[PDB]
Every structure is written in structure tokens, then in C-alpha cells.
């Protein structure tokens, strides 16, 4: 089984805003990765082991809109640059990688999966560099090992002249450390 | 919803075609030099490579292109006309062995289908099954490079 992915927009600009203010989202949830937004920006949130994780630089300290009103974050780690809320009812969680593979695949907000070679604990190089505009909105998305397990979450692009050659990510290890603190 | 793989057929038989980089590719031994049908009439092939057993027409409607592989993995996955996925171990430039041999009937009608890498990117097109006594243990395939070069 190869890694394939698809995206589906579930909500528009004006409905997003109202939902942001009310904090009550009645839409049905499906999937492992949620496309997420604030009046400021849009990025991704990945469900791993019952917890919906994302970048602190994106969600800040905000609540996530749910069918029962706003939901406070379960974990927040300004230093690890992570925040996590209970995974929405309906979503599916990924499980952390255990195979220790160094060949990773980043899933972008456009549901494209691009190969990245692990060059360290929090870095990996794009086998095929793409312009940063392409990676825009993918912060918080998952870096999967060949078996489809969470190795890390996309955090920042390593670019020059507007082209990203590597990616900086939050290894799944920092998640456990964050839940422990 | 758009598909990367088209299940196509001539008067003689059925097989598959895969859209890679804006072109709908398939096996010359299945399509020959035929045109592909469209609501505005028959459209001719853009590429005909009898030697590499490759033909290509402009991608049809309701299709979406597949990205060519660039991670060089050897863990391939053949997709059949029934949407079955078969893990294949790449043995060479254009050969691979099924991880679990299957009856030839199982791979019947899938030529032209894609051989995908762990990222779902096109590694090549399924050319022919290599069988022994009606059991497919391996497959022949046209590497994406051939396609990329033909263009």
C-alpha cells in the first residue's frame, strides 16, 4: 500500500469566520489531517494517537471550534512549538513510527505527498525542491515513514531565492515529551 | 473526482492507461496506433513508440495526472484494473517481482496501469506479466524516464 491522499474543503470564508466567533462547529469530521484556519492564517493539524496536534506558531493558544462549543488545548508547548486538542469526533489518528526509517514523505495541504530524506532529528531534504509558495499552508502536516506512520510534523521551510530545499520538522518524540510536561 | 488511471478497451481487448505529466499513456501492444475517443471525435496519439511499447494521447476529461517518482524506491505497488494494489520488488530498470505471486488472471487487463512508489508516484507503466505455469511472479514495466524522454 503506497501513500495516497485527498483533500476536501468543508467550509468557506464567511462560514469559517462565524464559526471562529461562535466556536460551535457542527460539521462532520473525517480524516487524519484537518485543514485549519484562524482569521490570520491557514495551516494543518494532524491527529496522532487520539490527539489533534498542530504548530504553536499557527494556533497560538486558541481553542478549537467543535460541535459543543470551543475546546481548550490539552497540550501547549511554546518551546516545542506544539499545541494539541482532543482529536475531533470522527477523525482518525495516525500512530508514531517505530521502524526508524530515514525516507519520509511530507503530506501537503494540497494532499500531495513529497519525498524527503532525513538528515537529522528535525531536518530532511526534498528529493525534489519546490517553491515555498507550494509548501505554504502545510505547517502542522505529517511527515510519514514508508509504512504511513507519523515521524514528525512540518514546521518550517529551509529555502533560498524562494525555493525550499529542506524542511524543518517537529519529530514525534517531542509530542510525548510535551504530553509528559 | 478525477482519475489518474483510465480503464480502456478496443474491439479486441481491455487494458489500462495512466495519465502522467498531461499525457494518457498505455501499451502499444494494446492500443496500436489507434486514436482515443472523445465527445468531439477521435483524437490521435501524441507519441507512438513501438520499440518501448508505448503510446500516448493528450490526457482526456475526468482525468488527473500522476507525478513521476523521484525518490528511487524499490518497493513498488502495481494497481490493477480492479483497483487491486500488488506490492512488487523492483529487480531492475524495468523488472520487478510480486511479493506474493498471483494467478495470471488476477493481473489480466492491467497493462498500461501504474507501478507506484511508497509516495504513490509513478515509477513506470505495467508492460506485461512474467509468469510460470499460469502464475505471475514478476512483471515487465516501462520506466517513467522512457515516458519523460519520449516527451
Amino acid at each position: 500500500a503506497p501513500i495516497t491522499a485527498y483533500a476536501q474543503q468543508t467550509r468557506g470564508l464567511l462560514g469559517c469566520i462565524i464559526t471562529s466567533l461562535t466556536g460551535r462547529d457542527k460539521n462532520q469530521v473525517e480524516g487524519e489531517v484537518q485543514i485549519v484556519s484562524t482569521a490570520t492564517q491557514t495551516f494543518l493539524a494532524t491527529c496522532i494517537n487520539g490527539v489533534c496536534w498542530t504548530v504553536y506558531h499557527g494556533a497560538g493558544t486558541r481553542t478549537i471550534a467543535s460541535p459543543k462549543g470551543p475546546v481548550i488545548q490539552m497540550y501547549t508547548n511554546v518551546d516545542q512549538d506544539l499545541v494539541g486538542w482532543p482529536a475531533p469526533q470522527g477523525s482518525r489518528s495516525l500512530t508514531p513510527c517505530t521502524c526508524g526509517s530515514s525516507d519520509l514523505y511530507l503530506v501537503t495541504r494540497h494532499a500531495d505527498v513529497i519525498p524527503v530524506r532525513r538528515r537529522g532529528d528535525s531536518r530532511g531534504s526534498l528529493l525534489s525542491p519546490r517553491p515555498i509558495s507550494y509548501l505554504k499552508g502545510s505547517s502542522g502536516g505529517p511527515l510519514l515513514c514508508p509504512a504511513g506512520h507519523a515521524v514528525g510534523l512540518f514546521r518550517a521551510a529551509v529555502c533560498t531565492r524562494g525555493v525550499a530545499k529542506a524542511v524543518d520538522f517537529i519529530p514525534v518524540e517531542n509530542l510525548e515529551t510535551t504530553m509528559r510536561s | 473526482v478525477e482519475g489518474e488511471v483510465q480503464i480502456v478497451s478496443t474491439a479486441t481487448q481491455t487494458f489500462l492507461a495512466t495519465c502522467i505529466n498531461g499525457v494518457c499513456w498505455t501499451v502499444y501492444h494494446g492500443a496500436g496506433t489507434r486514436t482515443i475517443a472523445s465527445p468531439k471525435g477521435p483524437v490521435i496519439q501524441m507519441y507512438t513508440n513501438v520499440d518501448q511499447d508505448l503510446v500516448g494521447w493528450p490526457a482526456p476529461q475526468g482525468s488527473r495526472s500522476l507525478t513521476p517518482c523521484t525518490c528511487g524506491s524499490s518497493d513498488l505497488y502495481l494497481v490493477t484494473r480492479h483497483a487491486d494494489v500488488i506490492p512488487v520488488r523492483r529487480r531492475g530498470d524495468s523488472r520487478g517481482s510480486l511479493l506474493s505471486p498471483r494467478p495470471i488472471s488476477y493481473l489480466k487487463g492491467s497493462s498500461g496501469g501504474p507501478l507506484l512508489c511508497p509516495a504513490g508516484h509513478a515509477v513506470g507503466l505495467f508492460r506485461a506479466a512474467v509468469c510460470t505455469r499460469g502464475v505471475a511472479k514478476a512483471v515487465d514495466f516501462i520506466p517513467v524516464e522512457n515516458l519523460e524522454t519520449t516527451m
Binding site: - | 480503464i7 480502456v8 494497481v79
Partner: peptide, 16 residues
């Protein structure tokens, strides 16, 4: 005789 498309496969399983 043209080659005719008789069906389509979506690799991601995208419904609808």
C-alpha cells in the same frame, strides 16, 4: 477503431 474509456480509477480513493 478508437480506444474508448470505459471506466476510471482514482488512486486516493476520493469519494463522490
Amino acid at each position: 477503431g478508437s480506444v474508448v474509456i470505459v471506466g476510471r480509477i482514482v488512486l486516493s480513493g476520493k469519494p463522490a
